[PDB]
């Protein structure tokens, strides 16, 4: 019981956030059925139960809304510092540096407000540090938003400048709830690795944004939408499907290592995407994707995989009018709230972690300069 | 069924780059005896042994030294953006928020020999530049353009002080930094290995490394502060009584395993004695010496020796070092392990993704507003 | 995996003797509500429904009345041993060590299914007043089998003939003391009940564990605080000091009840009736003043004055010793434990569980010369 | 899971006292290889590591010896109190109720964790000895002042001093019965250990649960050994009991299944001891006959078989097994209690209600 090349699987501490059973396919968010919660709720009480531990009171919700509105403003000297940056480089590194922005912003108060205030502060702040950076990289100056819109509507208007209907708003809200949280991600793993050191929240969040990026950041669902665009026509996809079968690679958007029985996220995504394509019309790329999906369903019948939620998700992102390469910022936005709840929990534990390792080094040498 | 505390003693890897004894007071840096290396070896030779694997030859080392001097400039757009930098934050937090985008000078994401030594030399150079900058910047001083003529120790001393110092003190400081070029693999190194496998970019790596270098709310500084608060040898018995009440190891005394007068502290004490012989003994030096004699009159039999924190604070005071960045000075010394780790971290590539003890309730419902 | 730490909420068995519901303050003993069951009944019928489970007849009532009255004899060797007992101890430990050796009298099943029953039923108040007067050092006051159970207890323990109303109130209180939540008494009772050794050691361990938390009890500190009231006019200062102390209000607060468990309501009604009939004295006036002062603003918590506060007042009206309230409640507690043991005879099931081996491994023993 | 009548076998606490491995058959008392520890150890430092937790020094040993000697006497008033007991009950229950009263001696209610600890450690032996003497009726006397602990126990129980070889054997035997996994003893103890009050009611409830139904395995082992009798009837009675279809006595442990090398040490020590010291031949014949008779169950001569043998080699009282059983179990119970006291949690599990509802008072019952 002392062999772990790679140090994988050893459970660490007491889970306190979400109940999920991959074999059973049960999504009980803190014991609450994820589908049932998403059936009749909004992200407000969701995050309330996530970090605050319960859905708050009505007056509490109204006060939280008014306060988030109050702190929804923007900074000017920041824009001056922001004006001192380019508009072409690696957006992941750009946003990572943009994390340090809040560093000196309120660095002095290292309490109740230190708990209550800074949370909603980071909530109303991070979306600016992301979207304004995107606008600047696009060469577009910021605009002071109107306060008569939802936070999601606020971000949508900031990135789009249009007045939409709220059906797509509720759809995008459920979507944010979809990629919102899960069990311990490797990002969440390193977060817990740093969630105890009792230094500050800002530097932890910054290092989380940094290490959260995988190899070259990016990801798969972006490549999924890219391959959907590259699909074009699906008439020859059958020869392409056969060539890919001869290529020995995983079926795109199929067979999650944990989700293997078509976790309700994927099925709900497919159903809602069908409803949207019925309401607003189906795209020719959407038709090509549907044809490719039918061909795949008739192709293998042996992988046990299902069309992942990414099938609906890349399509919804493209149809909503979203830049292709911005997915990683959305992933960080989702992970921020989970990291917040995790750090709120971690505040209790005065664990003071420290590891130790094994040595396979040499010994008893004799040095020689100019070797 | 056991969940050991902090996974203390887990086989995360099989480290072969170094070793430590902890019983005979032997620390094997690339398997090298402390005194034998410390006799007459430049820090660059040990760095070449650690990073290049072997003590490099004359030609390649000279080429590296020339290229280092060939790349010791200060960016202009840096000072331009720096005009928007604040002037209140912690100096270590300052160094972090400063390095927050130091990598943006190159985003190649690749060549192989180049991004095995080029960004390496960039890191080896740019640190003291931004360090002395923030040092003068906090003072609101006009920035001074850099020059690679004086030795890195002497160059940094002149940059921070506008004064050419005696190089003997520079060599002593280099030796102390070698004694401080790292510690045992730290929680910094721990989180580094928690990120070192992906080999994405050394920039954010050393960034999060410096971020973790800050402890709980971010040794030598507090000990020196306590010594200054005490002052002379008149408060000896009251301080002893207060410490006995406090029931804690004497400030500047007590080690986890180095209960054998860890050789780093002994070497620091010998060097401090030589320096006080050369530089003279100050009233603070005499008072602290009397206090140390009084403490040794009580804690000799406990196997506990004065910690290197006091000697480091005394050296900084004699060097006239600002208090706010002695931790940044250590980071300048200590973060040198990042390069050797990355060189070792590049050897393998493994992904760790463990589970958690599910101490959360299993079944509940969805309450609408209740 | 998962482990709710150490016997917290896991349901044990589908027992059906009683039932407690906190939604509306429902106590269903054999499915019978307490409030209606207390109208015009005797504790004997309640004990029948509890242990025997069947409503008994008046013929058996007279028979058992004759039998138990014949079971009032005091053991002489018990008195001789008491002559060797100490003289400065704890009454609870006294009762424990006293009953600790009942096996000396009855020693070494189908017929012994009612013998020890009536035996222990009679044994309690006698030995109680015995140890009490034993502390006093006076000669014993032999009881009489012509007085009612409450009347006989009052006489023997007090050498005075009482009036009926206080005895009826005491019986009602014993009924209030009858049933509670799942008690560590009942827990350890069912625990030792798997051993199937003897009801004697069962009641023994029940007394042993039933001791107050660290030999300190809620009712003891409640009477202590009632004495600590002292003056009455300064209630506002002490109230503010305790508000600063932020403790569960002295004489207010349970662990699971916040909907006014009707036990306290009936206690308030009985206390009002008694203080109306009986002399109030300064105690009742100061208590009424302090109670009104406390109830002035504590309504923000949805609780009332605690039962133990009224228990102290009841003991004062009885002039009871401090430690007396412990066995006073223990009477009805062990009475319920009797029905618990009766139900415990149902099935044979003995646990032998495991735990989490939180330790190191592969150690070594070094020589003392080496050490 | 929890919906299992009885609710047994689930992990409960991250204990740091005992570690066992049945499949490996390795025993490590907080990391102590059983036989390897038994090679060159003494029970004193053993209990020191068990409860105190660390190996002590020699000066501590001398101080402990002097203190134990200082606190080794008994009370005459206690002896008089002992005379008041009746004489028709279980001697084990007798010893239990006897210890159940010691509170009138060192009650009180840092240093108030150690002195009464060693006092209760030295206490129960002479108490149970006088209890046995009273059950008989014969008058006992105070022990000597130069004997070893085992030597004192012998010069009390048999009122005579034997050699030290059997003393070391009994030292191993106590270590042989030193501890085990979480017993029902430990479960009930934790059930009663809630408020972390004191050893007084602790060892009390410990005994009060320690007894079993119907008033012992080693007792039943000796009964069957007497039933073994001569050589020729082993096969006939063995086949008759095979037709009876009963669990293989002297064998077949539900939990232990690797035939713990402690049992091997027991067999070897029995062989080494019987050589210096009859009916052992008849017992060995019965054992070999049963072994050749079963050959399929993997059921080997259990501990109690050799335990009764060692007791006969000492010549212990018939029901005296419960006494040694407590002498082993109670110390570990006390260590577990002292540990669990540090928790400060107060368990309070809630059961399942499957009762009736809506019942009203019958005017005629």
Residue numbers in the entry:
A (entry chain y): 5 to 114, 117 to 377
B (entry chain 1): 5 to 114, 116 to 223, 226 to 377
C (entry chain v): 5 to 112, 117 to 379
D (entry chain x): 5 to 113, 118 to 223, 225 to 286, 290 to 377
Reported in the publication:
Here we report the discovery of a natural protein, citrate synthase from the cyanobacterium Synechococcus elongatus, which self-assembles into Sierpiński triangles. Bacterial citrate synthase (CS) proteins are homo-oligomeric enzymes that can assemble into dimers and hexamers. CS catalyses the condensation of acetyl-CoA and oxaloacetate to citrate as the first step in the tricarboxylic acid cycle. Using cryo-electron microscopy, we reveal how the fractal assembles from a hexameric building block.
